[PDB]
Amino acid sequence: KKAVINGEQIRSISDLHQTL
């Protein structure tokens, strides 16, 4: 029971309101 997913992107810039 697994679903496929296509679409990669590391546009995670500015962690102002985020955290690594």
From Swiss-Prot:
It comes from the Bacteria. Inhibitor of the ribonuclease barnase. Forms a one-to-one non-covalent complex. This is Barstar. Belongs to the barstar family. It comes from Bacillus amyloliquefaciens. The lineage of its organism: Bacteria, Bacillati, Bacillota, Bacilli, Bacillales. It is found in: Cytoplasm.
